[PDB]
Design a protein around this ligand. Sequence first.
Ligand SMILES: Nc1ncnc2c1ncn2[C@@H]1O[C@H](COP(=O)(O)OP(=O)(O)NP(=O)(O)O)[C@@H](O)[C@H]1O
Ligand SMILES: [Mg+2]
Length: 299
Amino acid sequence: HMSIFSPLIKKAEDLAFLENEEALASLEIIGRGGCGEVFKAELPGSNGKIIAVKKVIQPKMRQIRSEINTVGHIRHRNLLPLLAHVSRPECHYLVYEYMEKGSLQDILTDVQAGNQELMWPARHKIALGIAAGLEYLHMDHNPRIIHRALKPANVLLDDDMEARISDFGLAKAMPDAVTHITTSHVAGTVGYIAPEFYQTHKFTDKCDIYSFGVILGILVIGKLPSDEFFQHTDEMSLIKWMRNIITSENPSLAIDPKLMDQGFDEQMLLVLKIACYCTLDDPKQRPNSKDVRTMLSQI
Ligand SMILES: Nc1ncnc2c1ncn2[C@@H]1O[C@H](COP(=O)(O)OP(=O)(O)NP(=O)(O)O)[C@@H](O)[C@H]1O
Ligand SMILES: [Mg+2]
């Protein structure tokens, strides 16, 4: 079973090498995710167009095709357009356009090593991008879509440096909450799981607001939630450590020293505050995607 949502010319030219299991073994691996896997491949029919193939493993439910077909027909400037969905018997393949710039996670880890640099105006453009893509999913699409796995690795940068959200969360395809929490630890991505999910086992729109709030803090602090710096600190979490520095009398301490003297301190401090409201322990106290965008665009 195969469905296409984007002008890739022949349905057979893309199909042939994905059905061949031995064909993936020689493809380059761009994104390591354990169970989930992403490959790098050149589309044969196109004139040298590189694509990214996400491999998700399902653990007679056709609801996967129903939701993915909805995901495939979503078009937004800040959402990575799904190109094709291949459904094997016990596996699924998602086809995206390969972005040379990588993901937000890839860049931020490269900024730590100094192999890359990202200035605040770009981070501000990324935040506004994710905010625009979130509001469309939460309050503009005809069925309300919830991205249940929002993280900097699922925010890709195009050649215009606009954030694009990918690897959407599919309620039918996702594993049980207890396992999902377990692999979230090994992947170092627990920090994006809202506190309520531990008692609800259901992803809400406020869970997307929580994951977004962490990303806003990362863009200013420059450290990831899995950073061992936070495992030596007093609060033992990026969200709580950021919250106390906000209310401290020296809030600039949380700012990455790489964007200090650029004159964006006042702007970055306002982003930290919006990250606090998006990451409050009570989801009812958190803003929605519409108000989050308005606060980010007010600077
Ligand atoms: N269209 C794409 N273009 C370029 N790189 C991509 C693309 N999609 C994914 N990647 C890379 O894949 C990496 C993440 O791989 P992935 O298996 O999706 O783990 P994850 O995103 O952290 N969790 P999840 O996607 O929710 O299962 C990203 O950092 C990218 O480098
Ligand atoms: Mg990804």
